[PDB]
Amino acid sequence: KSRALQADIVAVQSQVVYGSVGNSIAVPAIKQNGLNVFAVPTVLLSNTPHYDTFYGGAIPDEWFSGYLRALQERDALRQLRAVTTGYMGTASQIKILAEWLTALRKDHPDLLIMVDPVIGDIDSGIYVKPDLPEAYRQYLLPLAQGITPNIFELEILTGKNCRDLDSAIAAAKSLLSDTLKWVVVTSQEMQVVVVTADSVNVISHSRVKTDLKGTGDLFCAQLISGLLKGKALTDAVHRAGLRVLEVMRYTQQHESDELILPPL
Amino acid sequence: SSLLLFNDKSRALQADIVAVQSQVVYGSVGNSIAVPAIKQNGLNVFAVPTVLLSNTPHYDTFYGGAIPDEWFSGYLRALQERDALRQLRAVTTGYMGTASQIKILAEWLTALRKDHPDLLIMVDPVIGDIKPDLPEAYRQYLLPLAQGITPNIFELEILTGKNCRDLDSAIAAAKSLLSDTLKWVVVTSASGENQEMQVVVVTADSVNVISHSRVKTDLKGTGDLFCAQLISGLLKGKALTDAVHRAGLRVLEVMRYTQQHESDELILPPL
């Protein structure tokens, strides 16, 4: 009966004027799967910070809080089935996001919250706002149904060394709960490990080291789409991984420094 | 379009258009409707926001604001530094957040014009609603750079300070804005139930008029959509009047479709 626009997903992450990272790549990827999505920016950059220059910044708490609240006040969540989180600007955004999410669950008992704990890697460590980690551990993590950390991020979230697979698995297992259903850990091959309370599925893709950014965001985008379209978890992870590899190939064949989406 | 035949291959994304307007998390106004419409036409575009709102200020609540000058200027500068303008054929302007953004945009444009002689700068003089600052910014900075403008009667009067309450006068004012740079003026007036969309296309050598019938609606963004389809039409070979006519029909088509689905926000049907 609502006359408002609806969406299957609310994607909360970065946005670039130029480039294919955050919602700039996730939205069209999600659209490709035949799903609707409202994108809520956490940062608005001209391009990723990896280039010689970059401009823009974090979306003000008041604006950010307003964007989320507006989706409710506009009654545009009648079809909401998932909320994905990616690159966050500040801890304050995470706390606000968590509060918004806690509020939603009361009306969307089946809401699938998928969070990508973008914090960093092992080379210099945390390449995002220093206060993000604690914010993830305190407010957001407790709400996630699934998470997609890399080794370093799983270590920061669990406070456990995860260099060895068996160690990463135990760490991921220790995170599972009535709320947290799965942990997808990403590690010349790429290792993607799917962990649930009763299983562990290791997926290895022959991947070549690239400088292309946003693949993690593309990954999560294709993953949630698959889960929402009825794909079993592992299959959904594998397909997401394959779509990413495919896009990277298409992009390189296109001789482009930014991800370009081929048809699905 | 870059004239450097000797330029090496750029690996950056390329775009035919750079649309500078508002953006809404929820809704179909500004680039939120223009980008998808442009995409439908098979063109590429870079969206540079002037304001990032939760939705239009027409609803009961709305949040967000104007993009800071530093960010705004940076976004425009980044497009140059990323070398993503080799295919740039046009820059459209819509709702501007502040006069300072207009100055910043204009400076960026003057610079660009030097490397893109074929640049079609199309300006939509969004002034007014249902502030001295904005009108003057347009007159000093953007007006002297535009190749074409799409004002309604009120905006045409504001920019020129002339009375345009009759065909001849409206034409006269539009003609007065023409120059070696300003090639055309598209003035429209919604007569309000079945609102009539009166349109007058004015150039140095001709005057053409278009008239569409429209059902009264609260739908927002139709003007931004019109512009998106206009620039798209022009970039795909359509002659001015033909492009204006088609842009108007496409808008009507989108509005009907929107109503057909009983939506309070524009939704694009196939093209």
Curated annotation (Swiss-Prot), chain A:
CDD domains with a match to the protein in the record: pyridoxal_pyridoxamine_kinase (cd01173)
Binding residues for ATP: D116, T148, E153, T186, H205, S206, R207, V208, T215
EC number: 2.7.1.35
GO cellular component, one term: cytosol
Keywords annotated in UniProt: ATP-binding, Kinase, Magnesium, Metal-binding, Nucleotide-binding, Transferase, Zinc
Residues reported in the UniProt entry to bind Mg(2+): Y127, E153
One Gene Ontology term of the molecular function aspect: hydroxymethylpyrimidine kinase activity
Source organism per UniProt: Escherichia coli (strain K12)
Self-association and partners: Homodimer.
Domain of life: Bacteria
GO biological process: pyridoxal 5'-phosphate salvage; thiamine salvage
Family affiliation: Belongs to the pyridoxine kinase family. PdxK subfamily.
Cofactor binding note of this UniProt entry: Can use both zinc and magnesium that is complexed with ATP. However, magnesium seems to be the preferred metal used under physiological conditions.
SUPFAM superfamilies according to UniProt: Ribokinase-like
Cofactor(s) demanded: Zn(2+); Mg(2+)
Effect of gene knockout: Cells lacking this gene lack pyridoxine kinase activity but still contain pyridoxal kinase activity. Cells lacking this gene and cells lacking both pdxY and pdxK are not auxotrophs, meaning that the de novo pathway of PLP biosynthesis is functional. For PLP salvage, the pdxY single mutant can use both pyridoxine and pyridoxal, the pdxK single mutant can use pyridoxal but not pyridoxine, and the double mutant can no longer use both compounds.
Lipid metabolism is among the record's keywords: no
EC top class named in words: transferase
Pfam families in the cross-refs: Phos_pyr_kin
Catalysed reactions, semicolon-separated: pyridoxal + ATP = pyridoxal 5'-phosphate + ADP + H(+); pyridoxine + ATP = pyridoxine 5'-phosphate + ADP + H(+); pyridoxamine + ATP = pyridoxamine 5'-phosphate + ADP + H(+)
Role description: B6-vitamer kinase involved in the salvage pathway of pyridoxal 5'-phosphate (PLP). Catalyzes the phosphorylation of pyridoxine (PN), pyridoxal (PL), and pyridoxamine (PM), forming their respective 5'-phosphorylated esters, i.e. PNP, PLP and PMP.
Pathway(s) the chain acts in: Cofactor metabolism; pyridoxal 5'-phosphate salvage; pyridoxal 5'-phosphate from pyridoxal: step 1/1; Cofactor metabolism; pyridoxal 5'-phosphate salvage; pyridoxine 5'-phosphate from pyridoxine: step 1/1; Cofactor metabolism; pyridoxal 5'-phosphate salvage; pyridoxamine 5'-phosphate from pyridoxamine: step 1/1
Binding site for substrate: S14, H50, D217
Protein name listed in UniProt: Pyridoxine/pyridoxal/pyridoxamine kinase
Activity regulation text: Is activated by the monovalent cation potassium.
